Amino acid sequence: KHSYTLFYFNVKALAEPLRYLFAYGNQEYEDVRVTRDEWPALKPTMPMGQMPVLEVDGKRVHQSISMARFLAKTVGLCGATPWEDLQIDIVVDTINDFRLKIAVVSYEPEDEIKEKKLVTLNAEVIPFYLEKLEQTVKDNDGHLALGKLTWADVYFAGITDYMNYMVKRDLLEPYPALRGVVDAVNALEPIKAWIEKRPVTEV
């Protein structure tokens, strides 16, 4: 019925939550891993010249969070009403805001102003977001939204390795409830099979 192709670099990073959602839904897709050398040539064929991109029946889309939301709908990992969908959207937006704050410091400045912001990141931002999310999980019985499995859980499990990579430590060590969410997603049979089969990469 539907043809799916994912374009990204040979890394997990922002595409890995999409790869998780495809695995979750038993959905065959072509996992195109563009080399650094080949990227100049393929860039003009990507919307806005960025990745990840999905091509769905020949039509290309971008914006990884919105594509994750779409894939979640196709696999029943959303809610039943606009209100429920909003609750999931909010927590994913919060996770993304957090990811962006880490990225801006880690991948951000070339010079060593990184030093001062990294202090603010570690001392204020990281503990602040992770404590909020930890409480959310406790308030929702081991889930990020709606007191049940949703794509917020799958997104978070799919993005945590990247966030860890960017700060160079296990961010979830102090947060057993958040670790519980990630472990529970990673233990789902098709996601487990994907993790075992996927290309081993640093990022």
Ligand X SMILES: N[C@H](CCC(=O)N[C@@H](CS)C(=O)NCC(=O)O)C(=O)O
Cα distances from 80 to residues 26, 69, 76, 93, in angstroms, run: 22, 14, 9, 19
Task: Give the position of tokens 């390795």.
Answer: 161
Q: How far is the CB of 50 from ligand X (least distance, A)?
A: 3
**Contact pattern from residue 1 through residue 40 relative to its own copies, giving x for each residue in contact according to CB under 8 A and a dash for the rest:** ----------------------------------------
Which of 5-13, 67-75, 182-190, 192-200 is the region at the interface with its own copies (rule: CB under 8 A)? 67-75
Distance CA 17, CA 189 (A): 16
* Total number of residues that touch its own copies (CB under 8 A): 24
- Cis status of the peptide bond prior to 40, with omega within 30 of 0: no
**Contact pattern from residue 121 through residue 150 relative to its own copies, giving x for each residue in contact according to CB under 8 A and a dash for the rest:** -------x---x------------------
Torsion, Cα 202 8 30 164, to 10 degrees, reads: 40
Task: Tell whether residue 135 is among the known ligand binding residues.
Answer: no
Distance CA 3, CA 118 (A): 42
Q: How far is the CB of 190 from its own copies (least distance, A)?
A: 20
**Contact pattern from residue 1 through residue 40 relative to ligand X, giving x for each residue in contact according to CB under 6 A and a dash for the rest:** ------------xx--------------------------
Q: Does 90 bind ligand X (CB under 6 A)?
A: no
* Total number of residues that touch ligand X (CB under 6 A): 8
Of 86, 95, 76, which is closest to residue 149 (Cα–Cα)?
A: 76
